[PDB]
mmCIF file of N, CA, C and O in Angstrom:
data_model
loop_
_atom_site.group_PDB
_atom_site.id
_atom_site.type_symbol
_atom_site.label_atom_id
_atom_site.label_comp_id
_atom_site.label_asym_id
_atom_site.label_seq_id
_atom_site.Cartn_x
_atom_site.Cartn_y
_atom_site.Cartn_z
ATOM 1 N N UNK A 1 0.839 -1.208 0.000
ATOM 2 C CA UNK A 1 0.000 0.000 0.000
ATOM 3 C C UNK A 1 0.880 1.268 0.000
ATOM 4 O O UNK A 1 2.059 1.181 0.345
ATOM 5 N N UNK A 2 0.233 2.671 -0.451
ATOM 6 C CA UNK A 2 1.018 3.864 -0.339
ATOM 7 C C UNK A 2 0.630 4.454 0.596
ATOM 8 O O UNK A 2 -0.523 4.737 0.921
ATOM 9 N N UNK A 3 1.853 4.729 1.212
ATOM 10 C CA UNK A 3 1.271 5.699 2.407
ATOM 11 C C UNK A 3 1.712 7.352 1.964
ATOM 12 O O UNK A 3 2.387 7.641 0.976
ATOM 13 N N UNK A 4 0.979 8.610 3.254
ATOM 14 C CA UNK A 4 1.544 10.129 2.891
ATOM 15 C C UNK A 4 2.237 10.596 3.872
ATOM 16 O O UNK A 4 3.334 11.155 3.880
ATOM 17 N N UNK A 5 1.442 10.297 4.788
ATOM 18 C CA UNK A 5 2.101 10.832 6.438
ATOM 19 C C UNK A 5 1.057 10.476 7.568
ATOM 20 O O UNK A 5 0.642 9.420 8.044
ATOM 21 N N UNK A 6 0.812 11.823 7.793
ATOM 22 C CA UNK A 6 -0.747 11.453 9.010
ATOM 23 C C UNK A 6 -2.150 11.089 7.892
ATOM 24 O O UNK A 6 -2.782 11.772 7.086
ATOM 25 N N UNK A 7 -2.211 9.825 8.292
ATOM 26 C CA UNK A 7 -3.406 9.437 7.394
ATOM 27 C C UNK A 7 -3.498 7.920 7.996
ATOM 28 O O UNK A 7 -2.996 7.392 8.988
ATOM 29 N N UNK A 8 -4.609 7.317 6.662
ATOM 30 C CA UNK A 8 -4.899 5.971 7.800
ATOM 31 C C UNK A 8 -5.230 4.844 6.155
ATOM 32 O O UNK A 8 -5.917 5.194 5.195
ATOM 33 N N UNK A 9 -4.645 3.785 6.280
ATOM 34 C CA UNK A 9 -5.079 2.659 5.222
ATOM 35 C C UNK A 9 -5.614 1.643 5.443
ATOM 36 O O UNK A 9 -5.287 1.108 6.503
ATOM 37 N N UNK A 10 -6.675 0.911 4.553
ATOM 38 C CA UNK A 10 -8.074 0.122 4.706
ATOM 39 C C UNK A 10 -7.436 -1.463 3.795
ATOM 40 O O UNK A 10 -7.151 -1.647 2.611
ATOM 41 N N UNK A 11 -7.412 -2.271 4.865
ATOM 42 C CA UNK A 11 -7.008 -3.886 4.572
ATOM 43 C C UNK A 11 -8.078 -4.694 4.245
ATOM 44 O O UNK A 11 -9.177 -4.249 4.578
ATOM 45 N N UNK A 12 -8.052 -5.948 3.584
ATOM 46 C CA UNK A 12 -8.805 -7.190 3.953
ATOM 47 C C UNK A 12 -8.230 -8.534 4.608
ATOM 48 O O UNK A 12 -7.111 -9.001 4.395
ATOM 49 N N UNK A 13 -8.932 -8.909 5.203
ATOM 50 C CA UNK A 13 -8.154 -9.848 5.946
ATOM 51 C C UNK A 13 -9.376 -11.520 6.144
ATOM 52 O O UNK A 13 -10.579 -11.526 6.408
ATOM 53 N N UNK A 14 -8.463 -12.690 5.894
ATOM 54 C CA UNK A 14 -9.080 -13.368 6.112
ATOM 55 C C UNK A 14 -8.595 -14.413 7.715
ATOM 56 O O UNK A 14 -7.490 -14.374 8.256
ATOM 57 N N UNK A 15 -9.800 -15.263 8.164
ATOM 58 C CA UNK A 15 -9.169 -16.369 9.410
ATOM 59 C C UNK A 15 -10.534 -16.973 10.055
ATOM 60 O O UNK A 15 -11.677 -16.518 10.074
ATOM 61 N N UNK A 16 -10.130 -17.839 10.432
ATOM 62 C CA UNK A 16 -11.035 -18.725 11.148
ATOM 63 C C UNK A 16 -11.405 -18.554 12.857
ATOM 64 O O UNK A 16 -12.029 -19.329 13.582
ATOM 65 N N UNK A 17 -10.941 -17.601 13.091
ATOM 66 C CA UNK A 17 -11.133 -17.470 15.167
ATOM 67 C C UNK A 17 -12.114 -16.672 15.095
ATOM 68 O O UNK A 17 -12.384 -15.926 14.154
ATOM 69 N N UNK A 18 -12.564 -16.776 15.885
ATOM 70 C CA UNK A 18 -14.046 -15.833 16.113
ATOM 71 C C UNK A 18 -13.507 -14.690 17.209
ATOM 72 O O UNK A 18 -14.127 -13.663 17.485
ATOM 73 N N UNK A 19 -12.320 -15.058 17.729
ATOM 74 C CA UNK A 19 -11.762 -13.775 18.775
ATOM 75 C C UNK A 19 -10.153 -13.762 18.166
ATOM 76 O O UNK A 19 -9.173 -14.283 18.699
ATOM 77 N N UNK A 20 -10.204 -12.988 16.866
ATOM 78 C CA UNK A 20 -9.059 -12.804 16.569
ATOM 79 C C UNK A 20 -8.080 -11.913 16.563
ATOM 80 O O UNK A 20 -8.247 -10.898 15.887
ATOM 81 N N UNK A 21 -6.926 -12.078 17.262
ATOM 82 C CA UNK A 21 -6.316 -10.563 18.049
ATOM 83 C C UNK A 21 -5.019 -11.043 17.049
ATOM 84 O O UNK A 21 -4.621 -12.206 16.985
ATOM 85 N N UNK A 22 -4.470 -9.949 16.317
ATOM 86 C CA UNK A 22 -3.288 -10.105 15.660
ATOM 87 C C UNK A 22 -2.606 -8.783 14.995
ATOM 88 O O UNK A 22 -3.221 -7.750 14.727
ATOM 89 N N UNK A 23 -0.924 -9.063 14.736
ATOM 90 C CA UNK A 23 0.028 -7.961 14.125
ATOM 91 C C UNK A 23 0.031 -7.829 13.044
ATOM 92 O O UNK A 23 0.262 -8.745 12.255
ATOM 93 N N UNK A 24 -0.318 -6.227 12.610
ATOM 94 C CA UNK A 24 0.056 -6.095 11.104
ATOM 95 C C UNK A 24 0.935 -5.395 10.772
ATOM 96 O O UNK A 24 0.698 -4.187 10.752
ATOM 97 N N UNK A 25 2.122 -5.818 10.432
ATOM 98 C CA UNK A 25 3.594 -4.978 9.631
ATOM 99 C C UNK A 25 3.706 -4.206 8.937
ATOM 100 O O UNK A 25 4.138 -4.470 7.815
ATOM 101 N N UNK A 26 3.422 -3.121 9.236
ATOM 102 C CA UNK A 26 3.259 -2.051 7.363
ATOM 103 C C UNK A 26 4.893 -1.323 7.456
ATOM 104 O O UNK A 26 5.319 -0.515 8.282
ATOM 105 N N UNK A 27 5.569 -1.940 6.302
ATOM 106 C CA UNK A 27 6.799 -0.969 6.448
ATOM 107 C C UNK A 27 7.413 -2.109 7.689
ATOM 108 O O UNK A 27 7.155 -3.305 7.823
ATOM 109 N N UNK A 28 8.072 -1.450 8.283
ATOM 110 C CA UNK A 28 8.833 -2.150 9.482
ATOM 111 C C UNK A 28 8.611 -1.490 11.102
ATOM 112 O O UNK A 28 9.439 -1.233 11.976
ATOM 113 N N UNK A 29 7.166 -1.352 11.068
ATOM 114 C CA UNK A 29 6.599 -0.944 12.469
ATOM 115 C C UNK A 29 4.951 -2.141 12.162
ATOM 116 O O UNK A 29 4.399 -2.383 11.089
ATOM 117 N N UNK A 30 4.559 -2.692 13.698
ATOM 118 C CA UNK A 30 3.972 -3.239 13.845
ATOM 119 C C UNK A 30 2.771 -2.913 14.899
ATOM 120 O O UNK A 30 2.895 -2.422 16.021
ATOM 121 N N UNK A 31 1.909 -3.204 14.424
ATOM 122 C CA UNK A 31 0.340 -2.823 15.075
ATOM 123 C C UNK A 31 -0.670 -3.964 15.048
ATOM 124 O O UNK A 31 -0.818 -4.752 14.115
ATOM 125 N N UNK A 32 -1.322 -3.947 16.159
ATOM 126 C CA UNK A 32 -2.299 -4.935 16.900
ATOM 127 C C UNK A 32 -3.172 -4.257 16.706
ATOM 128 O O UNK A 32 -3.182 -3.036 16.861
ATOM 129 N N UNK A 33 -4.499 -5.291 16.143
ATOM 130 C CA UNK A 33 -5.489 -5.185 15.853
ATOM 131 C C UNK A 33 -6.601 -6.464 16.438
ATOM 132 O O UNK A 33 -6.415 -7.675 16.325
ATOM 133 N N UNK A 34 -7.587 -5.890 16.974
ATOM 134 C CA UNK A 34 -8.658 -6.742 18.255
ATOM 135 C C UNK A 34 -9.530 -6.734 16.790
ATOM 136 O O UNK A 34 -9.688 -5.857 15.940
ATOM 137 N N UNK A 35 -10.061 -8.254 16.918
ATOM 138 C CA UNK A 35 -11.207 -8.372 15.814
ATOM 139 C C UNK A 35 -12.183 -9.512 16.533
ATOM 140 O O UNK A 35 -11.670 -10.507 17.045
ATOM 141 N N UNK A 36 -13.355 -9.341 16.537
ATOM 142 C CA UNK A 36 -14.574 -9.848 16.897
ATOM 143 C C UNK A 36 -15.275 -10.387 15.698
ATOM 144 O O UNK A 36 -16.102 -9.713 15.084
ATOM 145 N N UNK A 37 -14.955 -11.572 15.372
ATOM 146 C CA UNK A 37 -15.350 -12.574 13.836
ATOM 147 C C UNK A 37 -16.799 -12.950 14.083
ATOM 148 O O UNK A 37 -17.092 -13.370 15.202
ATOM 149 N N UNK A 38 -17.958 -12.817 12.926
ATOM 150 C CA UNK A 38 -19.154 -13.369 12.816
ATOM 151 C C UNK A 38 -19.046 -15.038 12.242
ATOM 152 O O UNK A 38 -18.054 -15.511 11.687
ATOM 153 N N UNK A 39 -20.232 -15.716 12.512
ATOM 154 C CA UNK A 39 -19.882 -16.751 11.457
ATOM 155 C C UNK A 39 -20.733 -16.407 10.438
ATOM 156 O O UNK A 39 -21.651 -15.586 10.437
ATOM 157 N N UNK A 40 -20.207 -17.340 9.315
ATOM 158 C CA UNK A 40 -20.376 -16.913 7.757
ATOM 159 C C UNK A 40 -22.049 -18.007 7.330
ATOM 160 O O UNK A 40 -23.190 -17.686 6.999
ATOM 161 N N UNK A 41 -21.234 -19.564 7.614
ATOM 162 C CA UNK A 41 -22.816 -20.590 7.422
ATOM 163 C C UNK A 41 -22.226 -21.543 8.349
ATOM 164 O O UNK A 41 -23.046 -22.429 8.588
ATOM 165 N N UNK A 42 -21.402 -21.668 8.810
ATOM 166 C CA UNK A 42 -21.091 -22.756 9.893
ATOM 167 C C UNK A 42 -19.347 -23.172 9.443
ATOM 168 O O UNK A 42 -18.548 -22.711 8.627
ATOM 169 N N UNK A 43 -19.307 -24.335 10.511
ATOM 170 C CA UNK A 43 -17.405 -24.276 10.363
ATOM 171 C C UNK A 43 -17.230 -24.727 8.516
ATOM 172 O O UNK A 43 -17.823 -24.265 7.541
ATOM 173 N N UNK A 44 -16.555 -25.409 8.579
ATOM 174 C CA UNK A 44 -15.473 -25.880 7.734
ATOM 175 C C UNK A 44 -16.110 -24.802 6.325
ATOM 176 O O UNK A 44 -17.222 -24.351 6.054
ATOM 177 N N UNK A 45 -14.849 -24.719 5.726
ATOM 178 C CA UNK A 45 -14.869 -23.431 4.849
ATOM 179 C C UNK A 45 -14.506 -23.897 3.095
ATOM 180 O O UNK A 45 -13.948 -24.941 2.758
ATOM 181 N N UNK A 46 -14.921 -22.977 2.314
ATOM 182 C CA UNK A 46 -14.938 -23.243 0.999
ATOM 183 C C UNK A 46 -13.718 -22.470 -0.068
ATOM 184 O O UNK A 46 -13.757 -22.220 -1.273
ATOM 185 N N UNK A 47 -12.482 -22.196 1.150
ATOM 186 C CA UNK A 47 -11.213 -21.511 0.582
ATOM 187 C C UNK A 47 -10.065 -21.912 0.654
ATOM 188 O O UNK A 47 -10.024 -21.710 1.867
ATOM 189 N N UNK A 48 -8.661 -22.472 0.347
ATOM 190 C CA UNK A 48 -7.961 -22.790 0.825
ATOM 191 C C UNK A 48 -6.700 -21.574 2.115
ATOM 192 O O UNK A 48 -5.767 -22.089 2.731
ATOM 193 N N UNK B 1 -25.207 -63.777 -67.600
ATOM 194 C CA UNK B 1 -24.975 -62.960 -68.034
ATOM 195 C C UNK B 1 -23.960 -61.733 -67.372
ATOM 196 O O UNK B 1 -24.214 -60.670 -66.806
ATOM 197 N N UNK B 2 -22.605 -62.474 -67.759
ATOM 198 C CA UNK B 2 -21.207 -62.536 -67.418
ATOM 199 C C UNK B 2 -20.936 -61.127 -68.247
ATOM 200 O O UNK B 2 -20.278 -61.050 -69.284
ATOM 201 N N UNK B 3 -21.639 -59.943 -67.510
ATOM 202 C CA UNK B 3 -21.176 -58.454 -67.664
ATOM 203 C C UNK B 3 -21.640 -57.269 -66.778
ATOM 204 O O UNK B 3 -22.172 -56.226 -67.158
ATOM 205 N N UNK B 4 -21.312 -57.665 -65.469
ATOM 206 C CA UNK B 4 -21.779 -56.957 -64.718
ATOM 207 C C UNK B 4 -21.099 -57.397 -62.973
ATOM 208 O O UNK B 4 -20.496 -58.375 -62.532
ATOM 209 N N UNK B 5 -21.536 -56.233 -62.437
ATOM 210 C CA UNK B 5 -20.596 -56.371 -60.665
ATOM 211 C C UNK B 5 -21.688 -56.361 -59.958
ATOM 212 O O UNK B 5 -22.638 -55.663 -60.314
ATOM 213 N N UNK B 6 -21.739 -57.131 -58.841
ATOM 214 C CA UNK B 6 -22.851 -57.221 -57.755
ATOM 215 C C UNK B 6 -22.312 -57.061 -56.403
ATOM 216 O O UNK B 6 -21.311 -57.747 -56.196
ATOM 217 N N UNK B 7 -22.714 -56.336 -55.429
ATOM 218 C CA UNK B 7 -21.997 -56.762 -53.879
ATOM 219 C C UNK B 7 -22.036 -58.251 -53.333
ATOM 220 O O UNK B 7 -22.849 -59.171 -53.418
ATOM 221 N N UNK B 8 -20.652 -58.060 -52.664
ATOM 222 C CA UNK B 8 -20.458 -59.653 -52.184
ATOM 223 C C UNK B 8 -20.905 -59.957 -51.313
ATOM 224 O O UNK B 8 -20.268 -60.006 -50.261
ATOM 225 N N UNK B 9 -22.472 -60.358 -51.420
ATOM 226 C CA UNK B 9 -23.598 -60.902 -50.599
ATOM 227 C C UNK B 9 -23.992 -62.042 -50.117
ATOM 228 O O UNK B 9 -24.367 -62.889 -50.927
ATOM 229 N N UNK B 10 -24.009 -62.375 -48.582
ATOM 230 C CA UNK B 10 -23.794 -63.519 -48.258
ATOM 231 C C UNK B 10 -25.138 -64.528 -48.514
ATOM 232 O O UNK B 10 -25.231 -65.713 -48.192
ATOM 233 N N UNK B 11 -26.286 -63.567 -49.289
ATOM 234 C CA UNK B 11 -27.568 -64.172 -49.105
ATOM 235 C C UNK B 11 -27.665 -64.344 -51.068
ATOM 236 O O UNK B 11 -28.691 -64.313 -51.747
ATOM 237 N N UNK B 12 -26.379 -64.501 -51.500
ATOM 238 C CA UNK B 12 -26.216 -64.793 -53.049
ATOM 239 C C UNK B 12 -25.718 -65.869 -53.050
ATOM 240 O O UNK B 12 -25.607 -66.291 -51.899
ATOM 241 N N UNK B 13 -25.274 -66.682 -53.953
ATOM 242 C CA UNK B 13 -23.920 -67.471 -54.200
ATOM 243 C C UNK B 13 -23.134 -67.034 -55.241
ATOM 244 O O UNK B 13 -23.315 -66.637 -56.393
ATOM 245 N N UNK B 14 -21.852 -67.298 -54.209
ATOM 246 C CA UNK B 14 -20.426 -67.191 -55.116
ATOM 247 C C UNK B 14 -20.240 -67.939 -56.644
ATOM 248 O O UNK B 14 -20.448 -69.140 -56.816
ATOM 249 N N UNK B 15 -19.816 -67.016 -57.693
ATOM 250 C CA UNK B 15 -19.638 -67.537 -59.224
ATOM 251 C C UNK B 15 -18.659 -68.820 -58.795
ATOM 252 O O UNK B 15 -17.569 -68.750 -58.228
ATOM 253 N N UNK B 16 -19.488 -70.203 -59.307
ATOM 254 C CA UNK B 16 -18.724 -71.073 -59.522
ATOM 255 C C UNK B 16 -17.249 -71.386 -60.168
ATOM 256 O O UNK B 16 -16.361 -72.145 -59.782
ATOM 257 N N UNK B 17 -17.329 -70.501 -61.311
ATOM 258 C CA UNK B 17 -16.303 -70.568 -61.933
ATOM 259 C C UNK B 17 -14.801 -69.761 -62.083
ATOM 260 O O UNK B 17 -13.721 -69.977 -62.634
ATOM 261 N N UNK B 18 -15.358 -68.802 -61.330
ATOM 262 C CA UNK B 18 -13.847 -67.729 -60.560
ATOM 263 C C UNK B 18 -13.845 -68.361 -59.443
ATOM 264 O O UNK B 18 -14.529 -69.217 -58.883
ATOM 265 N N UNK B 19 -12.574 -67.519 -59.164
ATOM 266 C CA UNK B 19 -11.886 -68.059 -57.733
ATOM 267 C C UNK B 19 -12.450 -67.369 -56.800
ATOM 268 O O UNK B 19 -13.654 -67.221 -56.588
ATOM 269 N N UNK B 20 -11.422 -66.881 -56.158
ATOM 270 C CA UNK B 20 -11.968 -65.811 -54.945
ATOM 271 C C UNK B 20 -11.294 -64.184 -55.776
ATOM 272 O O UNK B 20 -10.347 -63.527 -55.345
ATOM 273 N N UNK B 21 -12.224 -63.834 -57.178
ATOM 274 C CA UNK B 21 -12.361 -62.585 -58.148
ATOM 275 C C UNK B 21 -12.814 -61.878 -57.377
ATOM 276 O O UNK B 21 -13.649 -62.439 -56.667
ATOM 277 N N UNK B 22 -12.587 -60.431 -57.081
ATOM 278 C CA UNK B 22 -13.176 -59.638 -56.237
ATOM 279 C C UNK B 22 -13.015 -57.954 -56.537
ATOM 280 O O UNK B 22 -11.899 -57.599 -56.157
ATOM 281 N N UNK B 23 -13.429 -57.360 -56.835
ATOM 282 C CA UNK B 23 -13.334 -55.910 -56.948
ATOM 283 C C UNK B 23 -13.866 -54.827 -55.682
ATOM 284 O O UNK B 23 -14.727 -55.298 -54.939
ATOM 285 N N UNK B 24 -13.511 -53.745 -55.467
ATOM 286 C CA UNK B 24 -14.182 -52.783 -54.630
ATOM 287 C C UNK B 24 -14.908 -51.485 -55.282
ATOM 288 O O UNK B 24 -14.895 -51.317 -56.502
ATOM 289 N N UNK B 25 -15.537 -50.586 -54.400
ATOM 290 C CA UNK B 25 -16.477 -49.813 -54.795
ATOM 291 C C UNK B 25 -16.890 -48.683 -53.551
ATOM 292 O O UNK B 25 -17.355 -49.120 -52.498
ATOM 293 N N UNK B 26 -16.703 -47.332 -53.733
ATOM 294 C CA UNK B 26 -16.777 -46.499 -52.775
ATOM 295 C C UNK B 26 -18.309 -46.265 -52.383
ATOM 296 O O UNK B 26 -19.289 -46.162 -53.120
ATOM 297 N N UNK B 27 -18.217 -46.219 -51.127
ATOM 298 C CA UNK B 27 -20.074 -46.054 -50.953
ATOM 299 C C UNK B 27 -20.344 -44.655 -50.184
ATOM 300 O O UNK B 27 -19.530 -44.027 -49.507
ATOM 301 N N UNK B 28 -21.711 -44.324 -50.462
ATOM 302 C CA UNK B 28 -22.266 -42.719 -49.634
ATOM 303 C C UNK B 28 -22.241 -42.697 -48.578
ATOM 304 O O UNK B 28 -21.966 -43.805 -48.117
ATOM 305 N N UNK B 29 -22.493 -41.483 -47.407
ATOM 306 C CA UNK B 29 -22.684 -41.595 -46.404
ATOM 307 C C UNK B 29 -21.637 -42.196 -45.162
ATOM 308 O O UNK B 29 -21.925 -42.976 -44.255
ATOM 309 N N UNK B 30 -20.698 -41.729 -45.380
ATOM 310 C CA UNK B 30 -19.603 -42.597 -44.596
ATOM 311 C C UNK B 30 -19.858 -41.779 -42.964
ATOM 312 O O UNK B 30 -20.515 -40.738 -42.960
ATOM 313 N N UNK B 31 -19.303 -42.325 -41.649
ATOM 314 C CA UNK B 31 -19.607 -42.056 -40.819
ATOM 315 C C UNK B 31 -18.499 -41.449 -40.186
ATOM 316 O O UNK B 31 -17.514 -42.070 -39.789
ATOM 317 N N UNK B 32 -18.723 -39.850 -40.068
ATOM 318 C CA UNK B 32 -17.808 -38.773 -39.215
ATOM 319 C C UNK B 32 -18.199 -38.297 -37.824
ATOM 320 O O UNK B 32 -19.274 -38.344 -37.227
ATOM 321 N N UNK B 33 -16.776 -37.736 -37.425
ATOM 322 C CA UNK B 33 -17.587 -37.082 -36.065
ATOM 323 C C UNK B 33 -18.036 -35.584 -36.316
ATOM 324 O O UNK B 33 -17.485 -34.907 -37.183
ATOM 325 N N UNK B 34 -19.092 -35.080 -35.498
ATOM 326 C CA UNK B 34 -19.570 -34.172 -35.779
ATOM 327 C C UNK B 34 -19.979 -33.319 -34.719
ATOM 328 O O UNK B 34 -19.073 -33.600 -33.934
ATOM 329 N N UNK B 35 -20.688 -32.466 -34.100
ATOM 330 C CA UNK B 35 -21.377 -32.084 -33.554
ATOM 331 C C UNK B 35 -23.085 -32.071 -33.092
ATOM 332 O O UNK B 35 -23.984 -32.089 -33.933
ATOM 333 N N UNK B 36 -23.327 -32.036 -31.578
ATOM 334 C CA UNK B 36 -24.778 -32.473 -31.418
ATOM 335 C C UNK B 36 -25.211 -31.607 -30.662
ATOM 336 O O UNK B 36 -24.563 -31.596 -29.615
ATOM 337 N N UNK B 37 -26.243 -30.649 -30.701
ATOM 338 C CA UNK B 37 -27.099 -29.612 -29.813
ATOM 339 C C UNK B 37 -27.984 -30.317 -28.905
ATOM 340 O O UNK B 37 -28.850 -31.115 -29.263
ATOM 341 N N UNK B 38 -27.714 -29.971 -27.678
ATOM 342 C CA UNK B 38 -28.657 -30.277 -26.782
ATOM 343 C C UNK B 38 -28.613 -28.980 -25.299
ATOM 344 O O UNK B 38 -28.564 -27.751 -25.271
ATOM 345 N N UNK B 39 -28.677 -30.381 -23.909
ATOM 346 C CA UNK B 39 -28.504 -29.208 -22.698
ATOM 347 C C UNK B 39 -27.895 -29.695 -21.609
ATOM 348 O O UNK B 39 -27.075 -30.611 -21.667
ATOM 349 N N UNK B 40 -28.395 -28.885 -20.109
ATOM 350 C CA UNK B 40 -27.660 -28.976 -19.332
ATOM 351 C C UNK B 40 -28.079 -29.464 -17.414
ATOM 352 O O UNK B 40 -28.613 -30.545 -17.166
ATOM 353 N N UNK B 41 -27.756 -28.573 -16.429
ATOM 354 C CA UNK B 41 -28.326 -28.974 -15.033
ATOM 355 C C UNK B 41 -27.784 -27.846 -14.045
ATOM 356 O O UNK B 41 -27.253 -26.795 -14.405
ATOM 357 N N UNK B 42 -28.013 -28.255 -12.744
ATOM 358 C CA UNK B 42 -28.276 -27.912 -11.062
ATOM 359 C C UNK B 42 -27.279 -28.450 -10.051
ATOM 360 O O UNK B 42 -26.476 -29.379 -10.146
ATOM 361 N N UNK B 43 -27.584 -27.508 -8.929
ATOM 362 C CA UNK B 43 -26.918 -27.812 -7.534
ATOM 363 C C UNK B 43 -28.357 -27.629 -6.457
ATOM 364 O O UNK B 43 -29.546 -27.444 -6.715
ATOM 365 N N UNK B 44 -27.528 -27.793 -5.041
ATOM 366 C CA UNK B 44 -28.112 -27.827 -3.714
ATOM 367 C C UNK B 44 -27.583 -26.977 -2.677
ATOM 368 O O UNK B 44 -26.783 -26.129 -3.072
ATOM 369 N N UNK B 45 -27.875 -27.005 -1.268
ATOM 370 C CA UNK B 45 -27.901 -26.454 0.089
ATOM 371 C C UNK B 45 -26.433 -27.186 0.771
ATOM 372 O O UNK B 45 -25.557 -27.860 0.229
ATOM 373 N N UNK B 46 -26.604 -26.732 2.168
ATOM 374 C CA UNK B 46 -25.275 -27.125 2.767
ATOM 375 C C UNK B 46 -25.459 -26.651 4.295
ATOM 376 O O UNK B 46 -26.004 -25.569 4.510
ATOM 377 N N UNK B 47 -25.004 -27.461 5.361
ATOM 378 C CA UNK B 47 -24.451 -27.372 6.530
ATOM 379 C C UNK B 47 -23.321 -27.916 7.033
ATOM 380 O O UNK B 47 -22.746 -28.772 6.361
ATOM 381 N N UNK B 48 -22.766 -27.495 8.382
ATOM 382 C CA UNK B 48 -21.302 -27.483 8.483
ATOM 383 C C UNK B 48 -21.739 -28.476 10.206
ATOM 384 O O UNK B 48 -22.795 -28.510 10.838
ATOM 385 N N UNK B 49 -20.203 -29.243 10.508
ATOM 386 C CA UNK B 49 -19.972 -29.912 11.522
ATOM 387 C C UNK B 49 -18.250 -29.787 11.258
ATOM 388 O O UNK B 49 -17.618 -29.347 10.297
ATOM 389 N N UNK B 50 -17.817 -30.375 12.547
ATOM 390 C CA UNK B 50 -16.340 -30.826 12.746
ATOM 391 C C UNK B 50 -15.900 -31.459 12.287
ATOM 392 O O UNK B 50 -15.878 -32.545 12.865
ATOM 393 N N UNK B 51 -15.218 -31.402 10.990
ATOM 394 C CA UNK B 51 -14.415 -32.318 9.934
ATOM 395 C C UNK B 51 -15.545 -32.736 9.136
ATOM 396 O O UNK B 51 -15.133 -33.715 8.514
ATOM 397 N N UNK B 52 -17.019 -32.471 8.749
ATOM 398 C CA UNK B 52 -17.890 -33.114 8.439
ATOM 399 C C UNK B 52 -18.716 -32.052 7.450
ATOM 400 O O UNK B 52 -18.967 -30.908 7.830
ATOM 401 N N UNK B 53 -19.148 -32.608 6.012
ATOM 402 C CA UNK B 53 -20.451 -31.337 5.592
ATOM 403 C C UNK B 53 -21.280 -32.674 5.267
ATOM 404 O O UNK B 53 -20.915 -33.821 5.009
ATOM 405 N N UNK B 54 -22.915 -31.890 5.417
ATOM 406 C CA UNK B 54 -24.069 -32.175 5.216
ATOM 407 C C UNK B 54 -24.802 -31.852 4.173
ATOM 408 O O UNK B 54 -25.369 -30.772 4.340
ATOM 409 N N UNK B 55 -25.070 -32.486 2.910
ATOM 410 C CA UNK B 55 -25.901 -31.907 1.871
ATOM 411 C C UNK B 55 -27.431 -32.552 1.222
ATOM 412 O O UNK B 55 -27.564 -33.387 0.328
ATOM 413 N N UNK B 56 -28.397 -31.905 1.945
ATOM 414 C CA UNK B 56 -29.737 -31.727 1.570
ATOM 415 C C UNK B 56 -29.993 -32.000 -0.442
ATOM 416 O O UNK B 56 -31.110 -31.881 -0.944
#
């Protein structure tokens, strides 16, 4: 992604936890992000 | 009346007096591959378990 300075950039992200807490690397600084997952139609999934 | 060709028909009899005389002859309609128009179909529903799917 491009960044400018003070500003903010929009990801997609995929995973299977329904309480998924994880780091995202942009550049070589790292940030935690709290995510609260819905389910989609039930477990096992149709993606590799 | 020894002037003329007939197919070699098993519901004839063979000229006594030749051997095994035999000629060929190209025929109509020979059989190719081609193309055929027709159609097609469907799917279903789904539920989920642990290592397991279910389809209705």
């Amino acid at each position: 992604i491009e960044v400018e300075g003070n500003s903010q950039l929009q990801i997609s992200f995929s995973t299977a936890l329904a309480s998924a807490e994880f780091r995202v690397q942009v550049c070589s600084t790292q940030v935690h992000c709290a995510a609260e997952c819905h389910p989609p139609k039930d477990h096992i999934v149709n993606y590799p | 009346n020894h002037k003329k060709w007939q197919y070699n028909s098993p519901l004839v009899p063979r000229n006594a007096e030749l051997g095994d005389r035999k000629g060929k002859i190209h025929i109509p309609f020979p059989l190719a591959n081609v193309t055929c128009r027709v159609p097609k179909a469907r799917n279903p529903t789904v539920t989920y378990g642990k290592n397991q799917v279910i389809m209705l």
